[PDB]
């Protein structure tokens, strides 16, 4: 199939918790053009919930990447409020910078901890 005009990929990225424990960390966040702050507050941890939308012009090339998301902060009150948004838009591209940044600099909620030794359940007779 070569009808790349009709392809798309909606990926709801799992919430990524990014900890900004350094002035350089805040600096890189503010250097991200796709990140906008709508509530001027002091935060040490944020939660990025994004919904990437890819459109393909070829197998390896994205016709258009659009990532929209809501960045959340847990206040000392423990209320969760949207301190900002993610709004990335690009044409011909080879990846999503928002997903790359959150993957490298952030840990997803509910990380999967893998045992050193797998525990076999039941047996080849019962299963």
């Amino acid at each position: 199939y070569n009808d790349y005009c009709n392809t798309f990929q909606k990926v709801t990225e799992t919430p990524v918790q990014v900890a900004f424990k350094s002035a350089k960390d805040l600096a890189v966040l503010r250097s991200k053009e796709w990140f906008h702050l709508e509530k001027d507050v002091q935060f040490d941890v944020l939660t990025f919930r994004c919904e990437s939308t890819y459109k393909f012009k070829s197998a390896n090339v994205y016709s258009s990447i659009k990532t929209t998301g809501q960045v959340l902060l847990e206040l000392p009150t423990k209320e969760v409020i949207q301190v900002g948004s993610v709004d990335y838009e690009a044409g011909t591209s080879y990846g999503n910078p928002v997903t790359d940044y959150l993957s490298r600099n952030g840990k997803t909620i509910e990380e999967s901890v893998i045992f050193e030794n797998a525990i076999p359940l039941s047996s080849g007779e019962e299963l």
């Binding site: 002035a23 350089k24 960390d25 600096a27 890189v28 250097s31 991200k32 690009a90 591209s93 080879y94 990846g95 999503n96 910078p97 790359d100 940044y101 490298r104």
Partner: protein
């Protein structure tokens, strides 16, 4: 009499010179690290977004060249009075 010459340039008047030098170094290094991190992250963003000059390598040119010959006019300018005076044999 013995001569004490203080050529310190007024650094004796800085209170806590060590702490002040450390403060300046820490501020400068903090700025450098912040801008380094911002530049590296921006570069990675451009790399992941836009995806992933030929220099000629010199070679020896052993031109076993004879002594360069000047034009006859330039030779005559260097020695005009010598024409047809010496026995070439």
């Amino acid at each position: 009499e013995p001569v004490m010459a203080d050529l310190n340039g007024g650094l004796q008047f800085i209170d806590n010179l060590k702490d002040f030098t450390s403060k300046l170094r820490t501020d400068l290094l903090e700025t450098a690290d912040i801008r380094r991190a911002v530049s590296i992250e921006s570069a990675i963003e451009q790399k992941v977004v836009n995806g992933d000059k030929v220099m000629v390598e010199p070679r020896a040119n052993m031109k076993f060249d004879f002594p360069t010959l000047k034009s006859y006019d330039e030779i005559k300018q260097i020695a005009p009075e010598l024409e047809g005076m010496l026995d070439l044999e």
